[PDB]
């Protein structure tokens, strides 16, 4: 029951997904890694809930494995930051690249385009990074990179957490992630939009889409209310967004990490 024009609209974010995610991560290479060797207590707060164990499996067969160290609370807490700031900075990337090969996106004023970015990168990111989780070990798996979560569901405390699981739990199909982007990347609220009425129309039509697709392909009784489910998820994700910001601007204030391209997406 898709009208021809929402059957050419999830064709073009599938088409600008397939071209711009590189799902093996293949293409992420020469990322920094941890060293083989007060406000503080909030970045610490912030930080120890977010800790991963890194695994880099070699093309030979070789395998490299890191644990990361205690909080001390010291300097430890950052031995990550700067490879991860890497791992941010190759998938803003990708973003952009997504972005920039959609018809809807190209055809919007350039200020616009940069302050849709800005707005939405970390969230499309995000979004990006639960395809590649697995929620029954907790871990990542970008490729030849995995990263594992370090109890029970003490960890569905940290909102980015209880996201990922929360998202995968709803087993969606690669359209509605496609989709779940363009609702995200078409937010009329960003500050510096000026195409406001635009933005909004182009929001409203890929919701609608999303609401069809669900409509006409998922008819099970699991799936009733998938739709405000995913918008409700939407709304979690900008609030993630807004909180992520401030850490991370915390995180600059004690010792800089991010990259040019964080700090040009950051505003720095
Ligand atoms: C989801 C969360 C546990 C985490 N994912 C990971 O560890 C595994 C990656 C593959 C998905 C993540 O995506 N983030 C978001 C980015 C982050 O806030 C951050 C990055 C760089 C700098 Cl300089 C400062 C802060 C972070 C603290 C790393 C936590």
């Given at each position: 029951g898709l009208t021809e024009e929402q059957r050419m609209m999830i064709r073009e974010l599938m088409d600008a997904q397939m071209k711009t995610f590189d799902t093996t991560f293949?293409?992420?290479?020469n990322f920094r890694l941890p060293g083989v060797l007060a406000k503080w207590s909030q970045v610490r707060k912030d930080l120890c809930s977010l800790k991963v164990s890194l695994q880099l499996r070699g093309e030979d067969g070789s395998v490299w494995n890191y644990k990361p160290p205690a909080d001390?609370?010291?300097?430890?807490?950052?031995?990550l930051l700067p490879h991860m700031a890497d791992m941010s900075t190759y998938m803003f990337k990708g973003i952009i690249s997504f972005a920039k090969v959609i018809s809807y996106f190209r055809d919007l004023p350039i200020e616009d385009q940069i302050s849709l970015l800005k707005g939405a990168a970390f969230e499309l990111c995000q979004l990006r990074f639960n395809t590649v989780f697995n929620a029954e070990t907790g871990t990542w798996e970008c490729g030849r990179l995995s990263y594992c979560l370090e109890g029970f569901?003490?960890?569905?405390?940290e909102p980015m957490l209880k996201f990922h699981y929360m998202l995968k739990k709803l087993q969606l199909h690669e359209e509605e992630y496609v989709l779940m982007q363009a609702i995200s990347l078409f937010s009329?609220?960003?500050?510096?939009?000026?195409?406001h009425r635009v933005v909004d129309q182009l929001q409203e039509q890929f919701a609608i889409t999303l609401k069809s697709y669900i409509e006409c392909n998922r008819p099970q009784?699991?799936?009733?209310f998938l739709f405000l489910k995913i918008m409700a998820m939407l709304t979690e994700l900008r609030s993630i967004n807004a909180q992520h910001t401030q850490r991370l601007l915390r995180i600059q204030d004690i010792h800089p990490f991010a990259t040019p391209l964080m700090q040009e997406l950051f505003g720095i």
């Open positions: 293949s293409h992420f290479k001390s609370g010291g300097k430890e807490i950052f031995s569901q003490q960890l569905l405390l009329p609220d960003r500050p510096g939009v000026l195409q009784p699991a799936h009733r």
